[PDB]
Amino acid sequence: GPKAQLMLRYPDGKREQITLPEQAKLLALVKHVQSKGYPNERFELLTNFPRRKLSHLDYDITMQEAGLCPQETVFVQERN
Numbered sequence: 528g529p530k531a532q533l534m535l536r537y538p539d540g541k542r543e544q545i546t547l548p549e550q551a552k553l554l555a556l557v558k559h560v561q562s563k564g565y566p567n568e569r570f571e572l573l574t575n576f577p578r579r580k581l582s583h584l585d586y587d588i589t590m591q592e593a594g595l596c597p598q599e600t601v602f603v604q605e606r607n
Contacts, residue, residue: 531590534600535560553593554586556601565603575600582606 529549533556536542543563547555557567571582577596584593 529591529597531595532598534598535563536600536602537563537565538603538605547590549591549595550589552587552589553581553584556581556590557586560603569606570603571606573602573604575602 531547531549531551533545533547534542535545545559556572560570560572561567567582571580573580574595577594579593581593581601
């Protein structure tokens with residue numbers, strides 16, 4: 528069925544592609560980025576287009592509830 532095909536763009540220039548089911552919760556993505564060395568307390572996720580600050584959303588909602596598109600580019604940014 529429907530998926531969130533994600534391009535992750537880390538700020539050192541590393542890139543990673545993952546796919547999550549549309550019913551996966553945002554937390555899954557947050558935790559994945561955390562395991563890659565980018566803890567939520569210091570980093571936040573921003574989608575390119577549409578532009579969304581995912582840290583402004585509750586992590587317990589699903590990709591579909593968050594309104595993500597079938598394909599997204601997610602920038603990992605240091606919080607400000």
